[PDB]
Design a protein around this ligand. Structure first.
Ligand SMILES: [Cl-]
Length: 290
């Protein structure tokens, strides 16, 4: 599995700030927009995009505060990310898109799709965010750590001062071992502790046990939309998963309309690091019929 990032950089001004993005592939069709989450960047899609770029334009932004994008002096709430991604999409003049989404990129993508349903031609998703009713639905192997992330003082000491989202969560949530070169790519945006704010705000935004209420309500709204939507869907899952265990992927195969599931094999949360070639090949095979 490749460790390089052989993509020309692009930057667009969005709400006064520069956002980095990959933009490869042919420019005369429906683009495929890849949305990462915490604590990643477009680097997460590096081995998937080459499967898709022969046939389709691939656009993969770095969320504000992350990757090679600018770092404004924000609290990095979900709604900050909503504003910047909305403006990014308009700044590129995109009309219709196919979404390929993961983690907080999935909350962004589903929320955008709910608000712009006639512009979404397909959704490929994996390890996406749904309301989490209680901590019992969070895997036991990461329960105490994510409870600490959401504990006053403690969580900032872990994520800001110790860089735990990069140094602990990434290896914990990839089945295979990550290489030093890969880790150093993921570390690059967050060498300075102050810049780790988005990494801490994100787990404190997760919709767990009804809080924070704003996020619970917006996630419930986009999930209601997705369960009713005829849009084509492609859902990748692994065993044992983190947000989406195998039994839930099997239930979603029925409870989401026009949904095709793909078992990637062993996988936790960053499924793209365990089986990028099947994720890219299956997205490429599914696009033409959209
Ligand atoms: Cl998170």
């Amino acid at each position: 599995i490749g460790t390089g990032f052989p993509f020309d950089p692009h930057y667009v001004e969005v709400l006064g700030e520069r956002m980095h993005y990959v933009d490869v592939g042919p420019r005369d069709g429906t683009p495929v927009l890849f949305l990462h989450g915490n604590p990643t960047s477009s680097y997460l899609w590096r081995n998937i995009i080459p499967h898709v770029a022969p046939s389709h334009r691939c656009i993969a932004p770095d969320l504000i505060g992350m990757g090679k994008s600018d770092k404004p002096d924000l609290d990095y709430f979900f709604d900050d990310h909503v504003r910047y991604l909305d403006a990014f999409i308009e700044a590129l003049g995109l009309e219709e898109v196919v979404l390929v989404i993961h983690d907080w990129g999935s909350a962004l993508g589903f929320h955008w799709a709910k608000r712009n349903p006639e512009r979404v031609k397909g959704i490929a998703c994996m390890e996406f965010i749904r309301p989490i009713p209680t901590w019992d639905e969070w895997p036991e192997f990461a329960r105490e750590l994510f409870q600490a992330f959401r504990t006053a003082d403690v969580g900032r000491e872990l994520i800001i001062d110790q860089n735990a989202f990069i140094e602990q969560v990434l290896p914990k949530f990839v089945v295979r071992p990550l290489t030093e070169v890969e880790m150093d790519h993921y570390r690059e945006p967050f060498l300075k502790p102050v810049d780790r704010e988005p990494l801490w705000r994100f787990p404190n935004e997760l919709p767990i046990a009804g809080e924070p209420a704003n996020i619970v309500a917006l996630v419930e709204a986009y999930m209601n939309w997705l369960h009713q939507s005829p849009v084509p869907k492609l859902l990748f899952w692994g065993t044992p998963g983190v947000l989406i265990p195998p039994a839930e992927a099997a239930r979603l195969a029925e409870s989401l309309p026009n949904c095709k599931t793909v078992d990637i094999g062993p996988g936790l949360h960053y499924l793209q690091e365990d089986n990028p070639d099947l994720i890219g090949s299956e997205i490429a095979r599914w696009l033409p019929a959209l």
